[PDB]
Amino acid sequence: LEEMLTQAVQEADIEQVRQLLERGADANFQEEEWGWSPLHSAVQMDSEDLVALLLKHGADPCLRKRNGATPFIIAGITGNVRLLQLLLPNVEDVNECDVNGFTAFMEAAVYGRVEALRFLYENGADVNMHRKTKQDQERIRKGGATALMDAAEKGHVGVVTILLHAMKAEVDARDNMGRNALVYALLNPDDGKAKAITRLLLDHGADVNVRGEGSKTPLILAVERKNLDLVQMLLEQEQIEVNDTDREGKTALLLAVELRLEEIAKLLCHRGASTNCGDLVAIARRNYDSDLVKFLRLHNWKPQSSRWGEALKHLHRIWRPMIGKLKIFIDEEYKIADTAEGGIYLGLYEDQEVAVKRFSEGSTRGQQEVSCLQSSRANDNVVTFYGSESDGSCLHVCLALCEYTLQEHLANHRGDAVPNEEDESARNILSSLFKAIGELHRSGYSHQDLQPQNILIDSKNGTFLADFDKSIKWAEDPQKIKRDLEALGLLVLYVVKKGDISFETLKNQSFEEVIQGSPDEETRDLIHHLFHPGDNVEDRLSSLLAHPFFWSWESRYRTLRDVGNESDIKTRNQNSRILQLLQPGTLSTSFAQWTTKIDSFVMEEMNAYNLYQDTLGDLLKFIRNLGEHINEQKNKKMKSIIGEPSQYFQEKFPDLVMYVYTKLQNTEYMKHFPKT
Amino acid sequence: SLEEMLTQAVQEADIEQVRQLLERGADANFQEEEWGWSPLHSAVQMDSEDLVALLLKHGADPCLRKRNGATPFIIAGITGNVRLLQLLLPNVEDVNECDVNGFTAFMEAAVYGRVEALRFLYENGADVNMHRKTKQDQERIRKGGATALMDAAEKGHVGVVTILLHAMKAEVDARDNMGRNALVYALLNPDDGKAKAITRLLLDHGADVNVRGEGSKTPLILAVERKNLDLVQMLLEQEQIEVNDTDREGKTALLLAVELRLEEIAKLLCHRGASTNCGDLVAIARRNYDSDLVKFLRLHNWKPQSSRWGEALKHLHRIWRPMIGKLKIFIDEEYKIADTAEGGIYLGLYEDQEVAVKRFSEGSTRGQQEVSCLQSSRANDNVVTFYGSESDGSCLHVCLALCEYTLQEHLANHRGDAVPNEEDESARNILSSLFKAIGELHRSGYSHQDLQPQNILIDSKNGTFLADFDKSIKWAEDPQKIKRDLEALGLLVLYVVKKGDISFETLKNQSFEEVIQGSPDEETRDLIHHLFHPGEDRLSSLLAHPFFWSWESRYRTLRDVGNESDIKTRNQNSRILQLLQPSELSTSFAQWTTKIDSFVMEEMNALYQDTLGDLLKFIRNLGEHINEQKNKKMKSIIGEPSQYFQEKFPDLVMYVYTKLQNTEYMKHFPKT
Ligand SMILES: Nc1ncnc2c1ncn2[C@@H]1O[C@H](COP(=O)(O)O[C@@H]2[C@H](O)[C@@H](COP(=O)(O)O[C@@H]3[C@H](O)[C@@H](COP(=O)(O)O)O[C@H]3n3cnc4c(N)ncnc43)O[C@H]2n2cnc3c(N)ncnc32)[C@@H](O)[C@H]1O
Ligand SMILES: Nc1ncnc2c1ncn2[C@@H]1O[C@H](COP(=O)(O)O[C@@H]2[C@H](O)[C@@H](COP(=O)(O)O[C@@H]3[C@H](O)[C@@H](COP(=O)(O)O)O[C@H]3n3cnc4c(N)ncnc43)O[C@H]2n2cnc3c(N)ncnc32)[C@@H](O)[C@H]1O
Ligand SMILES: C[S@](=O)c1sc(Cl)c2c1C(=O)CCC2
Ligand SMILES: C[S@](=O)c1sc(Cl)c2c1C(=O)CCC2
């Protein structure tokens, strides 16, 4: 409670602070979050009195906080040299560094404290000392710069010359990345301070051929500064290398042209710049700078998409300005489709092909697009989100480049299956959707506008959800999930009908006529579960992935055969557990009277010794028996009337799979279901 | 080649080249099909008065449009030599013709500061106050609509800005389709003299200073962030400027003033009734060591998703830190996940999303190949999600999805889960994910080069993901080094099947034979052998190796093969059992009838030979009847049949697979 009262040292009311200690108070109590002590806080205030009042009570001036800084190293920042006088007699070393390396002397340089700089110099400060930081920091080649380098980057022109002339500072010292003070100097935005520090460093021997960020020579940071004075000052040096290139291969002259700098280019050419680092005239001409055009003539990428391959080769070929990491041109040739706002165009994000949805910089829907995308990057069935880039007035959200709408995809593949072949494709597309929407739901978003033009297919026939511009965080309103699940219902019928019924016809039908439009009992059941998912929605989608709809025909036949191989079915044991589940209590199904709807020959041949009864038990027994012997050669005749046996039984008995499914779902006999 | 000698000549400045060419019959309206440029266009962009004139004697259209829609007249507004504007004016239908983005010749003179053409187009009917009419896609994002004034203001053209407001009746508060006025454009020119002088000239004329620009920032707010007190003071001369207006992020002009270390600028917004508590201003001044501003006020939620790193990610979000582009990061042990070759990997915040961030020196060769590879991997669902990179100008920060556990940790946490001989579905799931990821990585053209359990990650939902592309390479350069990844996968197979009990590091010291011999079963031995001896899409096919078949599936396959007609009738010369016998060494199931319990054996003979067929037939028959009530005693000696046959004949599944691998009987294999 009484060490809460160090609040009093920042109210600057000295008269409480005396009482604090007498009442019982620790003057070295360090607040545990960042390490702040009273003396620490006192010296950042420049309060001559509080320094005196609590060194009177033993606050250590070599006490380190989280960052490693002592009140002495901080006193170099406030720059009042009387507080340096008050705690110097009690410091072990005037050249003590914090964990990033900053000394009292170096902090005087950063903050331009010119008379605090003076006291520490002839008091033993190491003028040329490079900074010692942490080991994680030194294998990234960080640290090592000097007070000179510090004064140069903070424009403290006064500090630089005092350091260079009164105190023998190494002008061409480098830090752990080879940066000299010259480099630090050329990143101050103020042009006057830059120019003066540069001459003050050049006249004394600073290496004018040094490298900094992005392998840029000083001369290159000068042209990219658009500051002709710096250029002429650096080219007054014999040993300047005018055709040095940066990381991306550009020379000082090339960029000078690119940025439409007439005089700056005119001067690099007039001083022996290499004119063949590129097509120089063509850049000036595209810049509508015909005065340079006149002066300068006097001296493999592979796209991945097939559909868009040829256009993305054209967009790679042409020149375009970059919007951050993105290369784009608004032209019909690169337009993929029309959106509410701005179309979606092809683009190049970090040299990768992408689709680009465009919003107004402040568009609420663009907000919601990026919010949802940013929460979905783990959702493997959501379009890959590369990132967004702003023009300052158009938000470019960049997405993976898919090949086809779901609707286009179905149209191109409508002829793929023979009219009654297993539709493996529908199962996969809808299953990805079921995953995509379920994971989207778990991440807290609901799509709100599911429809085939929002589902895209890639070069690998993966299906992906998209267009989150209308999504909503659903925690606020939890019943709103159920729209996605209804749309998913229509999407099941939409995809199973191979696209032959337009989505807009389905969105106008009632729930019942959509169920009625289903081609089989599996699909009818799945749609029904989507239209009535329960107020307890939770993760209903993940469970429906076990619906027989998703069982291959082989798996449904394997499961009928396995249920029919249970001991109590073959022995027709009516009071067994298995047959009490399947046929209890007395019938209006397709397999009532089933023995009277099998070909008369296969039937009686199959009575290879009473006979087969009209129980469902024996029909499973039947399917089991015929499954085991279909390919034996005494039955080659019978193999040909049945055709594929799975297809045979499902078509003569459309409700069979569903019926055995329903009766065994939460029983020990679920073990016979296929694996999911 | 007639008109491509003519288009060579119009830029050779060769006056007499172009004369013959044209008379000879060259088309003076020829448009190069890339961008639409005509000779007349190039002549006017060039400022060659002589060539423009000669190309009108031969009928060049001054209203001919190139790709953006610009005519040679509209281009003449840019070069700004009024002599060619006079030469093409009698032949333009309208002095106010726009290109497809809305630009008129008048607006172009404004943009390029060509003041003497600006006058020429004034007295010839130019619409000074025209807003730009642009494309449909551009206007549904509210782009376009800007004016000549807005153009001159944004390009510092002090000379052009004064003539539009005084001599030519320009609307000072005209607005664009985004509500930006000329004031907003003016305050974005980098030059301080040019900016400061243009700002005075539009405030005195009636520009509304309570407008919005980029990021909903008011003119006053762009002034603070300019750190230019002079600008601040002139907008501060209008009483109804609203000083407590808030931007996109809820910040006021006064809030930014302290944050940016602006003693003089802040002292002034307070003296103008700025709302002092939109955040703790004194805490920001003191954090900045600006004891001179602490002395002036002197006088007057987020949910982390990770569990393992959740509490630390709550602490990192809570504190203040500067941003590096989109990244919030603090270098401290408390936020350290692990240490790498260069710089450690720390927790971070990328666009307010939790992320792990690997750090390199700005120029590191290694940081390159990680970023090259990560950038190519976004379609790879089993490579860790790559958020983006940010450079501080001397450290490249690579930002990744935040997983919960290394594979070695994950196996350790689940080591006590399984009873000592249970089917290891976990091992199959982890390895297949690895198999997909390395195969998809290889298909994208990269090889990982340092596969090891510490580079494989497991997330909160027990999925596996690859990481550490810092030593990756584009493998076309050396297509053999692919086989380093495949060997590591071999070791990784044994490592995971041994549940983490044998260190990788022991595994790296064993010989190939010591890894094969150390394997618990024939599936694992065979799979590893193929990774050490492959034949560039080999990984995807091995996902169908019986190693990845469940025990039920393996027993299901032998039962099914054991049901082929020519096995049950022992048709000796049929194709199925011609495929089944070699040459080959001896197997554990030669003489197999003498390794079944005498009771089960005898019960089932009611002529089982040592053929492999009748063992498959045996498997098939017993599988069908095990559970009947006459066979309860026999059900009890065999137990679970799949485990029984695999333990009594450890080389059976591999053997049947190999003999049927690329035959029609491949159909009995489980579907993969
Ligand atoms: N009286 C108080 N009581 C209670 N709490 C307080 C009080 N006062 C402030 N607080 C709260 O503490 C929090 C911060 O604690 P701190 O200021 O003592 O420690 C800083 C930071 O945490 C910590 C590390 O920050 P970082 O991760 O960005 O690390 C910085 C950078 O990455 C690296 C660069 O070195 P180099 O590459 O140039 O060689 O070293 C750090 N650094 C850069 N310039 C520095 C400088 N002049 N002096 C010291 N360190 C510098 O060091 C302090 N710090 C950082 N930049 C600073 C700078 N320009 N000037 C002065 N100090 C700076 C504050 O945010 C605040 O909330
Ligand atoms: N004589 C030649 N013969 C053959 N080829 C040539 C020749 N000269 C140049 N080339 C090659 O043509 C290629 C680019 O074509 P282009 O310059 O003719 O057409 C540009 C672009 O295509 C096309 C669309 O480019 P963009 O999507 O980046 O769109 C720009 C902007 O986003 C959009 C709306 O702007 P705003 O009103 O919201 O501000 O209009 C463009 N625009 C900007 N400033 C413009 C200006 N002053 N005047 C007219 N349009 C301007 O418009 C041309 N363009 C762009 N910036 C321009 C600018 N500052 N000044 C003049 N024209 C500009 C060049 O690459 C070059 O290789
Ligand atoms: C990645 S983008 O989402 C995309 S690619 C592609 Cl083809 C289309 C779309 C759409 O939205 C709808 C129009 C067709
Ligand atoms: C994306 S990073 O690669 C990462 S996340 C994470 Cl937990 C760990 C790692 C490691 O390297 C090893 C330590 C654990």
TrEMBL record, chain A:
Q: Where does Mg(2+) 1 bind?
A: 449, 467, 469
Tell me which PANTHER family the record gives.
Answer: 2-5A-DEPENDENT RIBONUCLEASE (PTHR24141)
Say which species the protein is native to: Sus scrofa (Pig)
What molecular functions are annotated in GO for this chain? Answer: ATP binding; metal ion binding; protein kinase activity; RNA nuclease activity
Boundaries of every KEN domain copy? 553-676
Q: Which Pfam families does its entry note?
A: Ank, Ank_2, Pkinase, Ribonuc_2-5A
- The Protein kinase domain covers which part of the protein? 330-550
Could you tell me the keywords of this UniProt record?
ANK repeat, ATP-binding, Metal-binding, Nucleotide-binding, Repeat
- Keyword Repeat attributed: yes
Superkingdom is Eukaryota
Signal peptide bounds? none
Ranges: ANK repeats: 34-66, 67-99, 100-132, 143-176, 177-213, 248-280
**Which annotated residues bind Mg(2+) 2?**
454, 467
The protein here is known as Ribonuclease L
UniProtKB/TrEMBL annotation, chain B:
Q: Which domain of life is it from?
A: Eukaryota
Which molecular-function annotations from GO does this UniProt entry contain? ATP binding; metal ion binding; protein kinase activity; RNA nuclease activity
GO term, biological process aspect, one:
mRNA processing
Annotated residues for binding of Mg(2+) 2 = 455, 468
Pfam families given for it? Answer: Ank (PF00023), Ank_2 (PF12796), Pkinase (PF00069), Ribonuc_2-5A (PF06479)
Ranges of residues in domain Protein kinase = 331-548
Q: Which residues form the KEN domain?
A: 551-672
Q: Which positions are annotated as binding Mg(2+) 1?
A: 450, 468, 470
* Stretches forming ANK repeats: 35-67, 68-100, 101-133, 144-177, 178-214, 249-281
Database matches in SMART domains: ANK, PUG, S_TKc
Please provide the record's keywords in A-Z order. Answer: ANK repeat, ATP-binding, Metal-binding, Nucleotide-binding, Repeat
Record's protein name? Ribonuclease L
Q: What is the lineage of its organism?
A: Eukaryota, Metazoa, Chordata, Craniata, Vertebrata
